[PDB]
């Protein structure tokens, strides 16, 4: 929903979904580069928490 002015009144669902899909994108972009196992494990845990 847009509010009075040049800004937008966003809902929490948009922010949560954006965070989740960004985390998934980073997950995808790290796997193909043979990233260190510790870092991929940590970011997998952080995606799980998200």
């Amino acid at each position: 929903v847009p509010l009075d002015g040049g800004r937008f009144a966003t809902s929490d669902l948009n922010d949560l979904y954006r965070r989740v899909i960004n985390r998934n994108n980073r997950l995808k972009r790290l796997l193909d580069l043979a990233a260190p196992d510790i870092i991929v494990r940590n970011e997998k845990r952080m995606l799980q928490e998200a």
Partner: protein, 123 residues
Amino acid sequence: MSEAPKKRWYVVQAFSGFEGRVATSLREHIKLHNMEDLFGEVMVPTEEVVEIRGGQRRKSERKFFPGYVLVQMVMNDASWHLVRSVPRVMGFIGGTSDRPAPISDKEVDAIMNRLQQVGDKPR
């Protein structure tokens, strides 16, 4: 030091956009605390793909993996406290909390021979 181990790179995370700032802060902490033997070098991966058009021009700096820096420190308590003391840095990324987890030597070789080819198509 007291032994002859490989002070291999260790994973430390920072806040995005401050990786160079965190590296400089660590370097100046090492300089002022006068404890330089326990530490080696701070290295952050980066890559350079140059494009002559498309908005951003003549340079494009990215990271192999963001929000993580590598430290040449060694297992002890003084260095652990020193790294914890720097701002904008949370706990280590390893196994158990008190003692972090190192990186495999072969995979360290993989990361370093990936790093040595960054100087491809120079000039």
